[PDB]
Design a protein around this ligand. Structure first.
Ligand SMILES: COC(=O)/C=C(\C)CC/C=C(\C)CC[C@H]1OC1(C)C
Length: 227
C-alpha cells in the first residue's frame, strides 16, 4: 500500500468533502491493517468463514469460506448526518465490492450439501448509525466516545453473481433453471444476504479501528472543532 503520508486530519463540520475524504483516506491506510495502532485490514478483506440463512424456506444454509472482498477501502460516502443535539452520526457508504472465495450450500429441507467457488461483484450501499460524544480520557485529554454503530442495508445496485462451473452447474441442475437464476433462491440471498452480511463483517473491522484510534488521538484530530 503506497499510502503512508497521511491517515487522519481535522475537518470542518458539514463539509461532506472533508469528512468523506477523511473516511476514505483513513480507511485506505488501515486497509492493510497494522498491529501498531490496533487496526485490522479491510482491503483486501479475507473472511475465514461466513454463514447465512435463507428465509426462502428457512432451510437453506449458505456457509462461505475464505471470502476475498476487495474494493471497500476506496469506497465513497453517499450521505451523512451529524447531530450534536442528539450526538448521533448516520452515514452510508457505497462502492463496488468484489467477493471471491469458497461457498457451501447446505440444504436442510433437501438434506444435502454442496461446496464450490463463489465470486460476486457489485456496488454495496449501506447506512451506519453511531453516536459520538466528547469526554476526557484517564489522562485528562478530551477523547472521542464512539458509540455502538448500527448496520442498515439500503441497496446493492446490480448484483453480479458468479459461481464456479461445478457449483453453479450443481445449483442450476438442482433447481432446474439450467442457468442459475439470480432471484430464484437461495440465489436471492446469495445476492442479498451475502452482500449485506459481508458488508456488516467489514463494518465491524473498520469501526473497531476508529475506536482504538480515538484512544490514541483526541476528538479534534477528526474535526477542527467539535465543541
Ligand atoms: C464511517 O466513516 C466514519 O465513521 C468516518 C468519518 C465520517 C470521517 C472521519 C471522522 C470520524 C471517524 C469521527 C466519527 C466519530 O465516531 C467517532 C467518535 C470516531
Amino acid at each position: 500500500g503506497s499510502d503512508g503520508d497521511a491517515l487522519l486530519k481535522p475537518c470542518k463540520l458539514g463539509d461532506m468533502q472533508c469528512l468523506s475524504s477523511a473516511t476514505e483516506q483513513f480507511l485506505e491506510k488501515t486497509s492493510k491493517g497494522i498491529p501498531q495502532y490496533d487496526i485490522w485490514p479491510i482491503d483486501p478483506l479475507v473472511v475465514t468463514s461466513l454463514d447465512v440463512i435463507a428465509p426462502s424456506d428457512a432451510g437453506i444454509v449458505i456457509r462461505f469460506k475464505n471470502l476475498n472482498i476487495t474494493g471497500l477501502k476506496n469506497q465513497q460516502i453517499s450521505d451523512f448526518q451529524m447531530d450534536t443535539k442528539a450526538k448521533t452520526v448516520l452515514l452510508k457508504t457505497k462502492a463496488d465490492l468484489h467477493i471471491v472465495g469458497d461457498i457451501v450450500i447446505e440444504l436442510t429441507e433437501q438434506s444435502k450439501s454442496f461446496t464450490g467457488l463463489y465470486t460476486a461483484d457489485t456496488n454495496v450501499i449501506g447506512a451506519v448509525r453511531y453516536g459520538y460524544n466528547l469526554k476526557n480520557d484517564d489522562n485528562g485529554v478530551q477523547h472521542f466516545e464512539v458509540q455502538p454503530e448500527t448496520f442498515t442495508c439500503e441497496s446493492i445496485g446490480e448484483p453480479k453473481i458468479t459461481l464456479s462451473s461445478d457449483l453453479s452447474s450443481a445449483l442450476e441442475k438442482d433447481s432446474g433453471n439450467n442457468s442459475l437464476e439470480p432471484d430464484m433462491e437461495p440465489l436471492k440471498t446469495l445476492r442479498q444476504a451475502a452482500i449485506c452480511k459481508i458488508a456488516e463483517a467489514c463494518y465491524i473491522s473498520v469501526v473497531h479501528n476508529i475506536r482504538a484510534s480515538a484512544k490514541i488521538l483526541p476528538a479534534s484530530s477528526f474535526f477542527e472543532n467539535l465543541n
